[PDB]
């Protein structure tokens, strides 16, 4: 009946609503794998057509994350500057965590455009180092067998973090962070899943992967810019110069 147990239900709701695909849909489609003809078709496409495809899927992913943040109790109550600071540093980190749901650790494939395919699908992009890192991060995260409420609460904490440089009302972020930590700890105790806390990825790993990802995305956006209808215009202008 506590203010925290509600916070749990509310975070789980925002997440359920901003969830692009349902987990059992992703799990059942684990059989639906791209054929060598389909893989070759992706590999033979231009760098620029594979880029427009991936950039549009990644922008859509960020927009679901912005909506997940918007629906978190207290997020709107922060000043616009703090909202930008938190989403600029964390939105893509959330997108990267969420990918573990579309990842199949057995055949090392990811759900991309209706079917499951390996990293070979992305050859055309010519950044096999970054793509291998993304797949390796999803592969490590998959061993935790994250549940839907775990991903929800963990991703809310990835976003609500008072240790992001440039925050104005720092104590207002701390107040939201500490409530979400309590919700996360409380929830893990209730379900006997406190063991995942020791297995969680180090804060630096995520931060590092994401900065590399976003810089590679920024280079591609400079060379071949895609156009997106901004869900959060002040955030969009902070990433798209
Ligand atoms: O709809 C919006 O308001 C919105 C929509 C998307 C963002 C956003 N894009 N982004 C990218 O990395 C990105 C993507 Cl996903 C595709 C193509 C180019 C880019 C790049 F130019 F920024 F590099 C981000 C990283 C971190 C945080 C927010 C965002 C921001 C706002």
Short mmCIF file of C-alpha atoms and ligand atoms in Angstrom, two decimals:
data_model
loop_
_atom_site.label_atom_id
_atom_site.label_comp_id
_atom_site.label_asym_id
_atom_site.label_seq_id
_atom_site.Cartn_x
_atom_site.Cartn_y
_atom_site.Cartn_z
CA UNK A 1 0.00 0.00 0.00
CA UNK A 2 3.15 2.28 0.30
CA UNK A 3 4.14 5.21 -2.02
CA UNK A 4 7.05 2.91 -3.24
CA UNK A 5 4.93 -0.16 -4.21
CA UNK A 6 2.87 2.26 -6.39
CA UNK A 7 6.17 3.67 -7.89
CA UNK A 8 6.97 0.02 -8.87
CA UNK A 9 3.51 -0.50 -10.58
CA UNK A 10 3.74 2.98 -12.31
CA UNK A 11 7.33 2.35 -13.68
CA UNK A 12 6.19 -1.09 -14.87
CA UNK A 13 3.14 0.58 -16.60
CA UNK A 14 5.20 3.33 -18.44
CA UNK A 15 7.55 0.57 -19.55
CA UNK A 16 4.69 -1.78 -20.69
CA UNK A 17 3.18 1.18 -22.70
CA UNK A 18 6.54 2.37 -24.27
CA UNK A 19 7.57 -1.18 -24.99
CA UNK A 20 7.94 -1.38 -28.80
CA UNK A 21 7.44 -5.19 -29.00
CA UNK A 22 6.06 -7.63 -26.39
CA UNK A 23 8.53 -10.13 -24.84
CA UNK A 24 6.56 -13.32 -25.77
CA UNK A 25 6.23 -11.99 -29.39
CA UNK A 26 10.08 -11.59 -29.50
CA UNK A 27 10.47 -15.05 -27.85
CA UNK A 28 8.13 -16.88 -30.27
CA UNK A 29 9.75 -15.19 -33.33
CA UNK A 30 13.15 -16.67 -32.15
CA UNK A 31 12.56 -19.40 -34.83
CA UNK A 32 11.87 -16.86 -37.69
CA UNK A 33 15.56 -16.46 -38.86
CA UNK A 34 16.82 -14.69 -42.05
CA UNK A 35 17.92 -16.99 -44.91
CA UNK A 36 21.34 -16.59 -46.59
CA UNK A 37 19.54 -14.94 -49.60
CA UNK A 38 17.94 -12.33 -47.21
CA UNK A 39 21.29 -11.83 -45.37
CA UNK A 40 23.10 -11.37 -48.77
CA UNK A 41 20.34 -8.91 -49.75
CA UNK A 42 21.11 -6.81 -46.58
CA UNK A 43 24.89 -7.13 -47.13
CA UNK A 44 24.63 -5.95 -50.78
CA UNK A 45 22.59 -2.80 -49.88
CA UNK A 46 24.38 0.56 -49.83
CA UNK A 47 26.02 1.89 -46.56
CA UNK A 48 23.62 4.82 -46.81
CA UNK A 49 20.46 2.70 -47.23
CA UNK A 50 21.48 0.46 -44.25
CA UNK A 51 22.22 3.69 -42.34
CA UNK A 52 18.79 5.27 -43.08
CA UNK A 53 17.10 1.97 -42.01
CA UNK A 54 19.16 1.66 -38.74
CA UNK A 55 19.03 5.42 -37.98
CA UNK A 56 15.19 5.36 -38.25
CA UNK A 57 14.89 2.26 -36.00
CA UNK A 58 17.31 3.87 -33.44
CA UNK A 59 15.41 7.25 -33.49
CA UNK A 60 12.10 5.38 -32.97
CA UNK A 61 13.78 3.50 -30.09
CA UNK A 62 14.94 6.81 -28.46
CA UNK A 63 11.40 8.27 -28.84
CA UNK A 64 9.93 5.32 -26.92
CA UNK A 65 12.58 5.96 -24.19
CA UNK A 66 11.72 9.75 -24.12
CA UNK A 67 8.03 8.68 -23.64
CA UNK A 68 9.06 6.18 -20.89
CA UNK A 69 10.90 9.06 -19.11
CA UNK A 70 7.90 11.48 -19.61
CA UNK A 71 5.60 8.84 -17.95
CA UNK A 72 7.93 8.43 -14.87
CA UNK A 73 6.56 10.04 -11.73
CA UNK A 74 8.55 13.21 -11.08
CA UNK A 75 10.37 13.47 -14.42
CA UNK A 76 8.14 16.30 -15.79
CA UNK A 77 8.44 18.19 -12.46
CA UNK A 78 12.21 18.67 -13.14
CA UNK A 79 13.29 21.75 -15.10
CA UNK A 80 13.65 21.34 -18.91
CA UNK A 81 17.48 21.68 -18.57
CA UNK A 82 17.59 18.64 -16.22
CA UNK A 83 15.26 16.63 -18.53
CA UNK A 84 17.70 17.28 -21.48
CA UNK A 85 20.78 16.44 -19.33
CA UNK A 86 19.25 13.13 -18.16
CA UNK A 87 17.91 12.02 -21.63
CA UNK A 88 21.06 13.20 -23.52
CA UNK A 89 23.26 11.00 -21.29
CA UNK A 90 20.84 8.11 -20.67
CA UNK A 91 18.25 7.64 -23.45
CA UNK A 92 20.64 5.68 -25.76
CA UNK A 93 21.98 3.73 -22.77
CA UNK A 94 18.28 2.54 -22.21
CA UNK A 95 17.90 1.70 -25.93
CA UNK A 96 21.08 -0.42 -25.56
CA UNK A 97 19.77 -2.22 -22.45
CA UNK A 98 16.31 -2.83 -24.11
CA UNK A 99 18.05 -4.57 -27.05
CA UNK A 100 18.80 -7.57 -24.76
CA UNK A 101 15.08 -8.53 -25.13
CA UNK A 102 15.40 -8.86 -28.95
CA UNK A 103 18.68 -10.82 -28.53
CA UNK A 104 18.95 -14.64 -28.82
CA UNK A 105 22.11 -15.82 -26.95
CA UNK A 106 21.92 -19.33 -28.54
CA UNK A 107 22.46 -18.39 -32.25
CA UNK A 108 23.82 -14.84 -31.39
CA UNK A 109 21.08 -13.12 -33.44
CA UNK A 110 18.95 -9.99 -32.95
CA UNK A 111 15.36 -9.28 -34.08
CA UNK A 112 15.73 -6.88 -36.98
CA UNK A 113 12.94 -5.94 -39.41
CA UNK A 114 10.62 -8.96 -38.86
CA UNK A 115 13.30 -11.69 -38.47
CA UNK A 116 16.35 -12.74 -36.41
CA UNK A 117 19.82 -12.24 -37.91
CA UNK A 118 23.49 -12.23 -36.89
CA UNK A 119 25.88 -9.25 -36.91
CA UNK A 120 26.82 -10.26 -40.55
CA UNK A 121 23.48 -8.56 -41.55
CA UNK A 122 25.16 -5.19 -40.85
CA UNK A 123 28.40 -5.66 -43.02
CA UNK A 124 27.30 -2.72 -45.24
CA UNK A 125 27.70 -0.25 -42.35
CA UNK A 126 31.44 -0.92 -42.07
CA UNK A 127 31.74 -0.62 -38.29
CA UNK A 128 32.00 -4.26 -37.30
CA UNK A 129 33.94 -3.27 -34.16
CA UNK A 130 31.01 -1.25 -32.75
CA UNK A 131 28.38 -3.83 -33.84
CA UNK A 132 30.38 -6.67 -32.23
CA UNK A 133 30.55 -4.61 -28.95
CA UNK A 134 26.72 -4.00 -29.07
CA UNK A 135 26.12 -7.78 -29.59
CA UNK A 136 28.68 -8.65 -26.82
CA UNK A 137 26.89 -6.23 -24.40
CA UNK A 138 23.49 -7.87 -25.25
CA UNK A 139 25.08 -11.31 -24.88
CA UNK A 140 26.41 -10.53 -21.36
CA UNK A 141 23.07 -8.88 -20.25
CA UNK A 142 21.08 -11.92 -21.58
CA UNK A 143 22.74 -14.29 -19.02
CA UNK A 144 20.84 -12.35 -16.27
CA UNK A 145 17.51 -13.50 -17.86
CA UNK A 146 16.14 -10.07 -16.99
CA UNK A 147 12.42 -10.07 -16.31
CA UNK A 148 10.15 -7.28 -17.68
CA UNK A 149 9.89 -5.51 -14.29
CA UNK A 150 13.71 -5.77 -13.75
CA UNK A 151 14.41 -4.12 -17.17
CA UNK A 152 11.73 -1.45 -16.30
CA UNK A 153 13.21 -0.54 -12.90
CA UNK A 154 16.91 -0.91 -14.02
CA UNK A 155 16.30 1.36 -17.14
CA UNK A 156 14.50 3.97 -14.94
CA UNK A 157 17.68 4.13 -12.79
CA UNK A 158 19.92 4.36 -15.89
CA UNK A 159 17.92 7.58 -16.75
CA UNK A 160 17.37 9.05 -13.24
CA UNK A 161 20.99 9.55 -12.16
CA UNK A 162 22.17 12.61 -10.17
CA UNK A 163 25.81 11.93 -11.35
CA UNK A 164 25.22 13.47 -14.84
CA UNK A 165 27.28 16.69 -15.33
CA UNK A 166 25.26 19.87 -15.94
CA UNK A 167 22.29 19.34 -13.60
CA UNK A 168 20.78 22.48 -12.02
CA UNK A 169 18.30 21.14 -9.40
CA UNK A 170 20.68 18.21 -8.48
CA UNK A 171 18.83 17.48 -5.13
CA UNK A 172 15.49 17.10 -7.01
CA UNK A 173 17.15 14.36 -9.21
CA UNK A 174 18.65 12.67 -6.08
CA UNK A 175 15.16 12.54 -4.50
CA UNK A 176 13.77 10.70 -7.58
CA UNK A 177 16.86 8.45 -7.85
CA UNK A 178 16.74 7.35 -4.18
CA UNK A 179 13.00 6.50 -4.47
CA UNK A 180 13.66 4.36 -7.60
CA UNK A 181 16.63 2.58 -5.86
CA UNK A 182 14.31 1.68 -2.93
CA UNK A 183 11.63 0.51 -5.43
CA UNK A 184 14.28 -1.57 -7.31
CA UNK A 185 15.75 -3.11 -4.03
CA UNK A 186 12.22 -3.70 -2.56
CA UNK A 187 11.04 -5.39 -5.76
CA UNK A 188 14.11 -7.64 -6.03
CA UNK A 189 13.69 -8.76 -2.40
CA UNK A 190 9.93 -9.61 -2.87
CA UNK A 191 10.89 -11.87 -5.85
CA UNK A 192 14.17 -13.34 -4.48
CA UNK A 193 16.16 -11.88 -7.38
CA UNK A 194 18.67 -9.82 -5.24
CA UNK A 195 21.41 -12.01 -6.88
CA UNK A 196 21.19 -9.94 -10.13
CA UNK A 197 22.57 -6.80 -8.33
CA UNK A 198 26.05 -8.34 -8.18
CA UNK A 199 25.74 -9.41 -11.86
CA UNK A 200 24.64 -5.93 -13.13
CA UNK A 201 27.04 -4.32 -15.69
CA UNK A 202 29.50 -1.70 -14.30
CA UNK A 203 28.24 1.96 -14.87
CA UNK A 204 31.40 2.71 -16.94
CA UNK A 205 30.81 -0.19 -19.43
CA UNK A 206 27.38 1.21 -20.47
CA UNK A 207 28.63 4.86 -20.51
CA UNK A 208 31.66 3.80 -22.72
CA UNK A 209 29.66 1.64 -25.22
CA UNK A 210 27.04 4.42 -25.57
CA UNK A 211 29.56 7.30 -26.11
CA UNK A 212 31.22 5.19 -28.90
CA UNK A 213 27.79 4.32 -30.35
CA UNK A 214 26.53 7.95 -30.35
CA UNK A 215 29.85 9.26 -31.85
CA UNK A 216 29.65 6.69 -34.68
CA UNK A 217 25.95 7.75 -35.19
CA UNK A 218 27.02 11.44 -35.19
CA UNK A 219 29.68 10.79 -37.91
CA UNK A 220 26.99 9.00 -40.05
CA UNK A 221 24.49 11.85 -39.47
CA UNK A 222 27.16 14.37 -40.63
CA UNK A 223 27.87 12.36 -43.88
CA UNK A 224 24.26 11.34 -44.69
CA UNK A 225 21.67 13.21 -42.53
CA UNK A 226 18.27 11.57 -41.88
CA UNK A 227 15.26 13.74 -40.93
CA UNK A 228 13.19 13.10 -37.83
CA UNK A 229 10.01 14.81 -36.52
CA UNK A 230 11.15 15.72 -32.95
CA UNK A 231 9.18 14.28 -29.99
CA UNK A 232 11.33 16.45 -27.65
CA UNK A 233 12.57 19.47 -29.74
CA UNK A 234 15.08 20.88 -27.11
CA UNK A 235 16.72 17.37 -26.83
CA UNK A 236 16.76 16.82 -30.65
CA UNK A 237 18.63 20.16 -31.18
CA UNK A 238 21.23 19.11 -28.50
CA UNK A 239 22.12 15.92 -30.52
CA UNK A 240 21.55 17.09 -34.13
CA UNK A 241 23.69 20.36 -33.83
O1 LIG B 1 12.38 12.88 -31.34
C1 LIG B 1 13.25 13.45 -30.62
O2 LIG B 1 13.03 14.47 -29.93
C2 LIG B 1 14.64 12.85 -30.55
C3 LIG B 1 15.00 11.75 -31.35
C4 LIG B 1 16.28 11.22 -31.29
C5 LIG B 1 17.24 11.77 -30.43
C6 LIG B 1 18.58 11.14 -30.29
N1 LIG B 1 19.25 10.70 -31.34
N2 LIG B 1 20.44 10.15 -30.85
C7 LIG B 1 21.35 9.57 -31.75
O3 LIG B 1 22.39 9.07 -31.37
C8 LIG B 1 21.00 9.50 -33.22
C9 LIG B 1 20.07 8.56 -33.67
CL1 LIG B 1 19.23 7.58 -32.52
C10 LIG B 1 19.80 8.41 -35.02
C11 LIG B 1 20.44 9.23 -35.94
C12 LIG B 1 21.34 10.19 -35.51
C13 LIG B 1 21.63 10.34 -34.16
C14 LIG B 1 22.67 11.34 -33.74
F1 LIG B 1 22.84 12.31 -34.62
F2 LIG B 1 22.34 12.00 -32.63
F3 LIG B 1 23.85 10.77 -33.54
C15 LIG B 1 20.52 10.25 -29.47
C16 LIG B 1 21.48 9.85 -28.54
C17 LIG B 1 21.25 10.10 -27.19
C18 LIG B 1 20.09 10.74 -26.77
C19 LIG B 1 19.13 11.14 -27.70
C20 LIG B 1 19.34 10.89 -29.06
C21 LIG B 1 16.88 12.87 -29.65
C22 LIG B 1 15.60 13.40 -29.71
#
